[PDB]
Amino acid sequence: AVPSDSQAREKLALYVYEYLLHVGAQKSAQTFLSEIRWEKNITLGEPPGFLHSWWCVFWDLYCAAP
Amino acid sequence: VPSDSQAREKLALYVYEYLLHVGAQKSAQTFLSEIRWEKNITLGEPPGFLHSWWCVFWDLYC
Amino acid sequence: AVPSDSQAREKLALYVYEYLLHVGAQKSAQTFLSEIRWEKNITLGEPPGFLHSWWCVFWDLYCAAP
Amino acid sequence: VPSDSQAREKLALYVYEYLLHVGAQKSAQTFLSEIRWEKNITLGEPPGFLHSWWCVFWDLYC
């Protein structure tokens, strides 16, 4: 009843929306906001977007191994 | 190490999964069309790889 | 001449200091601040500390593989 | 997956490395004494594993 990861989920949606726009999937991005009933501001940062930047590092660490 | 190409492809795959699991199928299907995804589409259990790892990292930096 | 990762390095030092205190290495923590000529505030959060928390996740991802 | 024990031990090892590379040898040596580190001590090139990965992640969340 009291979300834990609320901020994280909101932000993931924001940054997925940004990602979709940035990869040229505008219709997908628009439909995404509709489907999830987005009610917040959309403030997009300087590209590259957060998700792509994050993914670059994440994927590097995921592929790395001891 | 991982190639830029591989990283990009995997991100698209995992975003597709995310969109399905968050309940945005129309968006997910449109996404594959807009990026001209031709390869095999597979996914796993909800909410998905991206969601799972995103949230654990987000929590740290809060 | 114009640092890039300045904040990151400052914060790493802060959180290493916290880690050292938390693992019972008080003398190490004290000597650390002396050796690096620390001139900033020391504001410690609720334990567990940031570095241990971060490491838990980082190490999980490092050990994971495709 | 990785055990809590393994994670803790590796963190200590990499903090030791960090302390050496940042120029805090007295702190590093004291650290090993305070945690009663008995095992093999090894390290690599500066600034070290912890520094390297810390900074790349920190930059993301800035």
UniProtKB/Swiss-Prot annotation, chains A, C:
Ubiquitous. Residues 8-40 form the LisH domain. It is found in: Nucleus. Coiled coil: none annotated. This is Single-stranded DNA-binding protein 2. It comes from Homo sapiens.
From Swiss-Prot, chains B, D:
It comes from Homo sapiens (Human). It is found in: Nucleus. Ubiquitous. This is Single-stranded DNA-binding protein 2. Residues 7-39 form the LisH domain.
